[PDB]
Short mmCIF file of C-alpha atoms in Angstrom, two decimals:
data_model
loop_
_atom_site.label_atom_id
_atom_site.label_comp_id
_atom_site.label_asym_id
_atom_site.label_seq_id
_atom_site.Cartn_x
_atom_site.Cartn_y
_atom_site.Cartn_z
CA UNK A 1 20.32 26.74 11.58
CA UNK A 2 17.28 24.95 10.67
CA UNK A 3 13.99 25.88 12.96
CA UNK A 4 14.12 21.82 14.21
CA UNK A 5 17.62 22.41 15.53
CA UNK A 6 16.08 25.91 16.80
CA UNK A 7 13.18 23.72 18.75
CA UNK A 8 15.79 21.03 19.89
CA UNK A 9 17.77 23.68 21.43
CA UNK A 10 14.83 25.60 23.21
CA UNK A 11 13.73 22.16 24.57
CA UNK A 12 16.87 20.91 26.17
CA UNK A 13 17.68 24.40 27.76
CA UNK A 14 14.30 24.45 28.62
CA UNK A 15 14.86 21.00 30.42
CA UNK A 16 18.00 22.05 32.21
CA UNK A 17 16.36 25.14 33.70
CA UNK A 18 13.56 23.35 34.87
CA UNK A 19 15.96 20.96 36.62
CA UNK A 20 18.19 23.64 37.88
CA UNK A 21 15.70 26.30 39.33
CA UNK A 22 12.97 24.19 39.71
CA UNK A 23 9.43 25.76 41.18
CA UNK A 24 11.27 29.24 40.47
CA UNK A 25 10.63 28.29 36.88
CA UNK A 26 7.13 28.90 37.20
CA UNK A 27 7.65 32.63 36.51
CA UNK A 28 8.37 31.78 33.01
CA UNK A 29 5.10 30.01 32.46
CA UNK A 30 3.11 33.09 31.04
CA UNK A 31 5.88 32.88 28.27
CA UNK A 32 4.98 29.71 27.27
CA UNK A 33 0.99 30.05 27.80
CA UNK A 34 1.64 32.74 25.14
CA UNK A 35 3.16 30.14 22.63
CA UNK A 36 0.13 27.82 23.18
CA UNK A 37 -2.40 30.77 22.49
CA UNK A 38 -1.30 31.85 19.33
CA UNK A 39 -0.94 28.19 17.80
CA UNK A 40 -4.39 26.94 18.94
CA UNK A 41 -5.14 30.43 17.67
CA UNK A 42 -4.89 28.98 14.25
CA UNK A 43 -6.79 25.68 14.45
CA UNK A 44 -9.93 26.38 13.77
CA UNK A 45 -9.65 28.54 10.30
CA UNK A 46 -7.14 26.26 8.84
CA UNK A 47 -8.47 23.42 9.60
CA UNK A 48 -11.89 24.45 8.17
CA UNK A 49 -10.29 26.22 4.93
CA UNK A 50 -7.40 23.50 4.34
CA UNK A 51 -10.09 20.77 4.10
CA UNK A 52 -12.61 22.54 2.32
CA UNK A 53 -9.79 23.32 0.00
CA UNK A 54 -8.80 19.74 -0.20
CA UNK A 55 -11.91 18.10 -0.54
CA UNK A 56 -12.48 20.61 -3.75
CA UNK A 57 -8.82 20.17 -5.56
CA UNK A 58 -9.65 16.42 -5.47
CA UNK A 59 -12.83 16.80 -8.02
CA UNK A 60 -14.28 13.60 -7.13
CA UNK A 61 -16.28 12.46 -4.08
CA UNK A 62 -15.65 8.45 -4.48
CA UNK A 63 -12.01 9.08 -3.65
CA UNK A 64 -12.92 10.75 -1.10
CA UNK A 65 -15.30 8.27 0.36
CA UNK A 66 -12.54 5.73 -0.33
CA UNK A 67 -9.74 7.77 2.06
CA UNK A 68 -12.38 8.28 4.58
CA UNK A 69 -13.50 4.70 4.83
CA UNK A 70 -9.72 3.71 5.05
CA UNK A 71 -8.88 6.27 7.65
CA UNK A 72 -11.86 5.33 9.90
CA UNK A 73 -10.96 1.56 9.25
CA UNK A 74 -7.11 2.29 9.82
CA UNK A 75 -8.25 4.32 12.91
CA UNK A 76 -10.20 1.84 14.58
CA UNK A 77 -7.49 -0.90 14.21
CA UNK A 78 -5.04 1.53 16.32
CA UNK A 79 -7.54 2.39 19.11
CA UNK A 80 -7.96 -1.50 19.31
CA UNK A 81 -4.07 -2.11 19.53
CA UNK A 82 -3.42 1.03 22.02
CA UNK A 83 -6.02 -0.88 24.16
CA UNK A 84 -4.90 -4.26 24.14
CA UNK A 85 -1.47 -2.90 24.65
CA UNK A 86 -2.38 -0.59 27.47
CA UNK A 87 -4.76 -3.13 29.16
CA UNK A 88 -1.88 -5.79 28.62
CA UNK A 89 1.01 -3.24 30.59
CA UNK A 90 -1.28 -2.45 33.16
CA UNK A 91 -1.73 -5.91 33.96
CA UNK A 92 1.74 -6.75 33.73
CA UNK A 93 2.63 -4.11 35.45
CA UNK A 94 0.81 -2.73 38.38
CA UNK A 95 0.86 1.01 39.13
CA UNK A 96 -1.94 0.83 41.27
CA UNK A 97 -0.63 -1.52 43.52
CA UNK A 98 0.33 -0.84 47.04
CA UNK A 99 -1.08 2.67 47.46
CA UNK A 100 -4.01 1.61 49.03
CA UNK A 101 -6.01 4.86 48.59
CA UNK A 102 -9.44 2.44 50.15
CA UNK A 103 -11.22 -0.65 50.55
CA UNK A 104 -11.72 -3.13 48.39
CA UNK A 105 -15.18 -3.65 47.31
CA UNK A 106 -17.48 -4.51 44.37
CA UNK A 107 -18.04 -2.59 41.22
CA UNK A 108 -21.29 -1.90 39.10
CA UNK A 109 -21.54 -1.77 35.35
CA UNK A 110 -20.19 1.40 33.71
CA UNK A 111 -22.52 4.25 32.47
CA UNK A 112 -21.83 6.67 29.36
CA UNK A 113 -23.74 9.04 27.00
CA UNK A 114 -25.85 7.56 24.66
CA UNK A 115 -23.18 6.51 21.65
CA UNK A 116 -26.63 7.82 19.17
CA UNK A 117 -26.07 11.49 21.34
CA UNK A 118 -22.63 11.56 20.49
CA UNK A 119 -23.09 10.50 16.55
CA UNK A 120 -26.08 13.15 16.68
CA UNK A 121 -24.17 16.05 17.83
CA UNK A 122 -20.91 15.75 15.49
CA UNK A 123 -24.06 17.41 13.11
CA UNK A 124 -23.81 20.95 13.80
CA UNK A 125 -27.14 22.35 13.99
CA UNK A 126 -25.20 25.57 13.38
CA UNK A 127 -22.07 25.88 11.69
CA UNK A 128 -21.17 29.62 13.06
CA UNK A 129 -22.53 28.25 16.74
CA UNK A 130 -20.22 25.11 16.04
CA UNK A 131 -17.28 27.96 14.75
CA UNK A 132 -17.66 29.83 17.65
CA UNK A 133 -17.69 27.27 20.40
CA UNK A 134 -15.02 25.52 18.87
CA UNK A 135 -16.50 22.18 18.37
CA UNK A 136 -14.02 20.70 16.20
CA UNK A 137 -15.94 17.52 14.75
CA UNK A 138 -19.00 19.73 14.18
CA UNK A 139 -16.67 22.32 12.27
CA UNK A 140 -14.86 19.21 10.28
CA UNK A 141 -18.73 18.00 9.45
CA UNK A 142 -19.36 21.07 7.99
CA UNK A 143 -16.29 21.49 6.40
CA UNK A 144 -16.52 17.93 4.69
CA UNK A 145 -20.28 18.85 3.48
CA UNK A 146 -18.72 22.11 2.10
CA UNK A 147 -16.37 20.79 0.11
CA UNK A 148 -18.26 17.99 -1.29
CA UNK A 149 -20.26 20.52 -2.43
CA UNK A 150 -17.43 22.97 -3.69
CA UNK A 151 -16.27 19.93 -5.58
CA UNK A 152 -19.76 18.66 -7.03
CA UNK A 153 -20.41 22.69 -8.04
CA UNK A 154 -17.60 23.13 -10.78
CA UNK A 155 -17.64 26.96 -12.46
CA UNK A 156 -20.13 28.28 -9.77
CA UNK A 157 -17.73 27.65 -6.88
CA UNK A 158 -15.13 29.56 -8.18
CA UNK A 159 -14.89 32.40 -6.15
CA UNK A 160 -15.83 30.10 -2.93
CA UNK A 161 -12.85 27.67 -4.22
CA UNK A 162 -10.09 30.42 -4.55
CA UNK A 163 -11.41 32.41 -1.45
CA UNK A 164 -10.70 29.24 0.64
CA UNK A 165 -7.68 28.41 -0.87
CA UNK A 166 -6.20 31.82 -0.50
CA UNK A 167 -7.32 31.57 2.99
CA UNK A 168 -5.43 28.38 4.00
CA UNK A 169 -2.49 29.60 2.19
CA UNK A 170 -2.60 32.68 4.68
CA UNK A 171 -3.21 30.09 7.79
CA UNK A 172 -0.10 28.60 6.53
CA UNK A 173 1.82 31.76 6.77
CA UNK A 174 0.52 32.97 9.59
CA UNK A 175 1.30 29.59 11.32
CA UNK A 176 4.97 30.65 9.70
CA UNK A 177 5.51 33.41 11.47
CA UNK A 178 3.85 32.49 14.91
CA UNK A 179 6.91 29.81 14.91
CA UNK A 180 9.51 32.08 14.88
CA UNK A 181 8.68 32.53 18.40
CA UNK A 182 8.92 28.51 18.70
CA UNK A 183 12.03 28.15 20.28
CA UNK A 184 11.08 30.30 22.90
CA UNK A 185 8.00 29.21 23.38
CA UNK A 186 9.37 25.58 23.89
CA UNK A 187 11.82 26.31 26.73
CA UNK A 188 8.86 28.13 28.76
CA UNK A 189 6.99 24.91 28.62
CA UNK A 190 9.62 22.80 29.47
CA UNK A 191 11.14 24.80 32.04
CA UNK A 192 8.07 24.84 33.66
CA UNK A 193 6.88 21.54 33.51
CA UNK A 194 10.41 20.32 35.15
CA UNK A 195 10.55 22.56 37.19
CA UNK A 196 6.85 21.86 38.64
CA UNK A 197 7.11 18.16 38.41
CA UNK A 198 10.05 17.54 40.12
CA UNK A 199 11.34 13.47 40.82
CA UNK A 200 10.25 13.58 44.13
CA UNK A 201 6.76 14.58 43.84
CA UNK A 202 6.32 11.77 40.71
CA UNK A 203 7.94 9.31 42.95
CA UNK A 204 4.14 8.29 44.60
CA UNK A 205 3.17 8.01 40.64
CA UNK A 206 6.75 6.95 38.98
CA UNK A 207 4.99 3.19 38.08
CA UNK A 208 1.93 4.82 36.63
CA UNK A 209 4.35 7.30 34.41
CA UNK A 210 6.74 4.45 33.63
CA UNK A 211 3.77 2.45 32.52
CA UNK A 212 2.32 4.91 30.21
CA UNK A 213 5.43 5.98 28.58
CA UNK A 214 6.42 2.36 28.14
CA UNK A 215 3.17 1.47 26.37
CA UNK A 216 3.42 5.07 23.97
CA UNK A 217 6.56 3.55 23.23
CA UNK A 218 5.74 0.03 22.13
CA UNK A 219 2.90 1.43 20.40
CA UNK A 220 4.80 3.49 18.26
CA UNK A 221 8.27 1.37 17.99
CA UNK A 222 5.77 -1.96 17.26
CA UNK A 223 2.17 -1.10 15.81
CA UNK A 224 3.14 1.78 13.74
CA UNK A 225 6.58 0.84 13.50
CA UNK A 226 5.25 -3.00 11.47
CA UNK A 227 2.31 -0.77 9.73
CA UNK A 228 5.13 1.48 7.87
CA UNK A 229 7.41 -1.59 7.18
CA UNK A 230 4.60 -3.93 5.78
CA UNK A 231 1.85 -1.44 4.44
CA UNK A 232 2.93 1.29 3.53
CA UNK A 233 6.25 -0.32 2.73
CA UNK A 234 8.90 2.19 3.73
CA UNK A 235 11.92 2.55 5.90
CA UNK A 236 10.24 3.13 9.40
CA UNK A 237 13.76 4.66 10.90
CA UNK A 238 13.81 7.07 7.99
CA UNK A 239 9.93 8.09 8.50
CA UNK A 240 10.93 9.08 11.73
CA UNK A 241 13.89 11.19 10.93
CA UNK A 242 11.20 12.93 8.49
CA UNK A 243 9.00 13.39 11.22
CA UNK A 244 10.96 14.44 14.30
CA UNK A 245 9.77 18.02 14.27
CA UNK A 246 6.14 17.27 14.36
CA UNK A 247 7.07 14.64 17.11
CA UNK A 248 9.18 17.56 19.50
CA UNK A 249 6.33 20.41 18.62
CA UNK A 250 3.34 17.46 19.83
CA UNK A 251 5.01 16.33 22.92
CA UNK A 252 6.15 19.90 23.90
CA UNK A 253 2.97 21.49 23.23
CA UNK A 254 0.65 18.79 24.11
CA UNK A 255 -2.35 19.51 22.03
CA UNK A 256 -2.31 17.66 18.83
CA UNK A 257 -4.81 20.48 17.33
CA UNK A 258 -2.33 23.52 18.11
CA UNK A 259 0.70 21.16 16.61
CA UNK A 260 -1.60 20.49 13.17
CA UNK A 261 0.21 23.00 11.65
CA UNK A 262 3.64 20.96 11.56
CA UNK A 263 2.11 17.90 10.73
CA UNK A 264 0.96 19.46 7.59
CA UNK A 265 3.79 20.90 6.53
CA UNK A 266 6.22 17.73 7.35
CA UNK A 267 3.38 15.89 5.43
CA UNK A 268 4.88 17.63 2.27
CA UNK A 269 8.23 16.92 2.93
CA UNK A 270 7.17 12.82 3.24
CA UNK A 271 5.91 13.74 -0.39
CA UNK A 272 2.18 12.43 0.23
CA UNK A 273 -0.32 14.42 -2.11
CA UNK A 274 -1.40 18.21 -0.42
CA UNK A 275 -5.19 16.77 -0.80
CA UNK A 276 -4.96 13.89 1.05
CA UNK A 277 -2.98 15.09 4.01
CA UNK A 278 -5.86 17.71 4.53
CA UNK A 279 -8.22 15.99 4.85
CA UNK A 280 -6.20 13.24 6.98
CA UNK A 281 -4.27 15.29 8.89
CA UNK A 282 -7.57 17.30 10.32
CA UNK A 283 -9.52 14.86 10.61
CA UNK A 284 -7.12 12.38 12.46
CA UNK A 285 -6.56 15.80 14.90
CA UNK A 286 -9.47 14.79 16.09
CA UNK A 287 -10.74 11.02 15.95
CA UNK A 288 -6.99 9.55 16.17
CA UNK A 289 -7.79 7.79 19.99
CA UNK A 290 -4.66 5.84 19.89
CA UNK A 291 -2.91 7.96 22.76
CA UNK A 292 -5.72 9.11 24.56
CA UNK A 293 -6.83 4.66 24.27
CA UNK A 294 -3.75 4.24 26.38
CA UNK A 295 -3.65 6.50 28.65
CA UNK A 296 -7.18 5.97 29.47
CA UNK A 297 -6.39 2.21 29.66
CA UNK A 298 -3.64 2.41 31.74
CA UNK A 299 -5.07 4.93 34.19
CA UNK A 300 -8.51 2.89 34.81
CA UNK A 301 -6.72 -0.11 35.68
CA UNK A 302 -4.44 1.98 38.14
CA UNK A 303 -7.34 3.09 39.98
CA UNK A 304 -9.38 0.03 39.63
CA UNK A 305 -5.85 -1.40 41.64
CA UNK A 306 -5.07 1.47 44.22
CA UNK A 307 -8.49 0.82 45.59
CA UNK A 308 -7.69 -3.05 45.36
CA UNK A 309 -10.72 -3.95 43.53
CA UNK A 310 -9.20 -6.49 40.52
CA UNK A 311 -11.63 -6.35 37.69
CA UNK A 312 -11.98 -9.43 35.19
CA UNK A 313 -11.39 -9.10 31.46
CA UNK A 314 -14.87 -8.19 30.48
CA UNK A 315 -14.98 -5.60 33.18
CA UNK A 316 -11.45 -4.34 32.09
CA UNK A 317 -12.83 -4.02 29.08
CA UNK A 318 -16.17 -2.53 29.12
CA UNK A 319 -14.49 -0.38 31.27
CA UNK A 320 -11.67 1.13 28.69
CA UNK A 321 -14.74 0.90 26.39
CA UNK A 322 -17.34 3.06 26.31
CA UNK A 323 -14.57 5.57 28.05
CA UNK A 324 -12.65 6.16 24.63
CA UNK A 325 -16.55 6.04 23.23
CA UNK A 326 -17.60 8.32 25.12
CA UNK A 327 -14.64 10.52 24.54
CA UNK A 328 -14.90 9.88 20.67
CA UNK A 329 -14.70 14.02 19.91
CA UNK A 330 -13.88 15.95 23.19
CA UNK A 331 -10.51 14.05 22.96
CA UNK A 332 -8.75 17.16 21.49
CA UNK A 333 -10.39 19.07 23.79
CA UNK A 334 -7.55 19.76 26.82
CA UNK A 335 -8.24 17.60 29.94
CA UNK A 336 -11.47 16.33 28.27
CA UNK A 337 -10.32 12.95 28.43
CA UNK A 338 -9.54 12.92 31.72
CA UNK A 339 -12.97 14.26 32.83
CA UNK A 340 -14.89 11.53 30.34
CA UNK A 341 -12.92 9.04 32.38
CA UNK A 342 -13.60 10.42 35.60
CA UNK A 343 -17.52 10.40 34.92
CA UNK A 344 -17.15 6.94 34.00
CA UNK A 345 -15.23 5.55 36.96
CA UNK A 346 -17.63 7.46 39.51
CA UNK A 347 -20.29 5.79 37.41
CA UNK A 348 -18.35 2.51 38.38
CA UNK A 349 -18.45 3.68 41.69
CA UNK A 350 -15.05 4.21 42.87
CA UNK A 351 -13.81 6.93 44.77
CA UNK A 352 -12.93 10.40 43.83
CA UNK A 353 -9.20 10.84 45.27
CA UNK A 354 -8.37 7.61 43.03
CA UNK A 355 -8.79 9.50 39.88
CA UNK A 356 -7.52 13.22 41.44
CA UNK A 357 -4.63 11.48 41.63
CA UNK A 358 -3.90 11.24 38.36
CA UNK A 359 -5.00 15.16 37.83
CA UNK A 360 -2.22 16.03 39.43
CA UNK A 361 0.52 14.88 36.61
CA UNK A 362 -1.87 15.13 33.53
CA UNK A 363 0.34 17.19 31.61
CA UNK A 364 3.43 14.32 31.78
CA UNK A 365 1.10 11.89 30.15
CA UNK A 366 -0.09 14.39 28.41
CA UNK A 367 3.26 14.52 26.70
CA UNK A 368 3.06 11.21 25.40
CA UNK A 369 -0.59 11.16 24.34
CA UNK A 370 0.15 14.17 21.92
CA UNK A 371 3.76 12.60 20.49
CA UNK A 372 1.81 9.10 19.90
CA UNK A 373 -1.74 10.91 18.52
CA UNK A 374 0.55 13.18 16.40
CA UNK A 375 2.88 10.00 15.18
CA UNK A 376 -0.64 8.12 14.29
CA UNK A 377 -1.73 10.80 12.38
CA UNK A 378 0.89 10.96 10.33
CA UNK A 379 1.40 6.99 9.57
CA UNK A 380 -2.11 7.40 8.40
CA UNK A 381 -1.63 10.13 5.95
CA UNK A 382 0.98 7.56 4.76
CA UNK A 383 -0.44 4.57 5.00
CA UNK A 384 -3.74 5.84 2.85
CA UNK A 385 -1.80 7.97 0.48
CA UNK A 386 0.56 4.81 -0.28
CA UNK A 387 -3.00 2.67 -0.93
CA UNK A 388 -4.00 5.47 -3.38
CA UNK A 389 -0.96 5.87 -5.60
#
């Protein structure tokens, strides 16, 4: 039995037990919070040898300026879709609506970090510092100057080259055997997230919920869906059934970082080159905003409407931007997305409890803001690996 089919059956027992014993499932947690240690246990050495190791194999720096100028390029198009398409369900639909958390009053003009502060400190200032705190643009700046330079060296990088190589190889197989323990790990998580978010206490937030899942959803059956068919010109239905591991892993673990590991190795079986998927497939762990766009759209609109005050389109939109600007590189960072948004919407001025709201189900749209970062990444790796051969 293949270890998807494994997954697949972890998950849905998982599901059933969190539905049967519901809160009692929180004993299982710890087995689950094990599962999430040991794979973001990972991220930080493979991602720093497995690009280093693909910017050398490559041998030349214009094609790698090339695939980064495309991925940024192809990135940016998808955080602008996720936004218009979360902005454009939140309208339609209103989760904020009704609940009446306070008065309706005016709204000042957003405030965020400097965007020159947040270019400045994707520079490590130093890379061990950067290593050790796990700063994981810093670490993928460092990593990109490396291996520019591994490539550029030739004969004298040798030793660096095969060191690095060996290294990822061994990230690979230690990411091999921490997923024997997958299955396992999977029904802990989804036991207890069932059985903790029961459908009565997501009742209060079931049009929020709805509303996010229903934009993940168009964004991946529509934007990446009519990218495959037309770009990168292959089935999209097919992709998918390529891809369904890395999709279960994402929205199970909820951390694209700590599900990089399956991305990369379903990016083989798609057949797109080992040196472009890492330095895609890291790099996208990272920038790819497209889920955390939505959700961030969707929930600043929701508590722009529970407290009643209707915000016009530039509002709306200076609003959801500078929000997924500010939260440019803490994005992979758990819950950092939600804080960047919180700063900004208390810069706005409205009310705390609003946006403690939404704390209190994070981890369901958390779900979907993994499976739809995860899915991006990977139509990228194809999209710029199709434009290259």
């Amino acid at each position: 039995m293949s270890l998807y089919h494994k997954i697949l059956i972890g998950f849905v027992l998982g599901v059933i037990v969190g539905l049967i014993f519901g809160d009692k499932a929180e004993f299982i947690k710890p087995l689950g919070d094990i599962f999430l240690r040991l794979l973001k246990m990972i991220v930080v050495p493979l991602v720093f040898s497995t690009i280093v190791t693909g910017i050398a194999s490559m041998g030349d720096v214009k094609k790698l300026g090339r695939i980064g100028a495309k991925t940024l390029i192809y990135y940016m198009i998808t955080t602008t879709l996720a936004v218009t398409i979360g902005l454009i369900l939140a309208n339609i639909f209103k989760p904020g609506k009704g609940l009446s958390l306070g008065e309706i009053h005016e709204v000042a003009h957003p405030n965020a970090p400097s965007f020159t502060e947040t270019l400045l400190n994707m520079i490590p200032t130093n890379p061990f510092e950067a290593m050790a705190e796990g700063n994981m643009l810093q670490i993928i700046v460092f990593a990109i100057f490396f291996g520019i330079a591994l490539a550029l060296m030739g004969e004298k990088a040798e030793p660096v080259k095969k060191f690095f190589d060996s290294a990822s190889e061994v990230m690979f197989k230690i990411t091999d055997i921490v997923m024997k323990f997958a299955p396992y790990g999977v029904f802990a998580l989804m036991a207890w997230t069932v059985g903790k978010y029961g459908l009565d206490v997501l009742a209060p937030l079931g049009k929020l919920i709805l509303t996010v899942y229903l934009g993940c959803i168009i964004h991946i059956l529509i934007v990446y869906t009519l990218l495959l068919r037309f770009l990168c010109k292959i089935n999209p239905l097919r992709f998918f059934k390529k891809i369904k591991e890395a999709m279960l892993v994402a929205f199970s673990t909820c951390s694209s970082a700590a599900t990089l590991p399956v991305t990369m190795r379903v990016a083989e079986e798609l057949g797109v080159p080992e040196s472009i998927a890492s330095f895609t497939l890291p790099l996208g762990a990272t920038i790819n905003m497209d889920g955390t766009a939505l959700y961030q759209g969707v929930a600043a609109i929701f508590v722009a409407q529970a407290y009643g005050v209707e915000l016009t389109l530039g509002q709306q939109l200076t609003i959801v931007l500078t929000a997924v600007l500010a939260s440019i590189g803490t994005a992979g960072v758990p819950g950092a997305g939600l804080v960047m948004l919180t700063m900004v919407l208390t810069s706005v001025g409205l009310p705390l409890e609003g946006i403690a709201l939404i704390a209190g189900i994070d981890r369901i749209l958390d779900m979907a803001r993994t499976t739809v970062n995860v899915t991006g990444d990977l139509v990228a790796t194809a999209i710029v690996a199709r434009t290259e051969n």
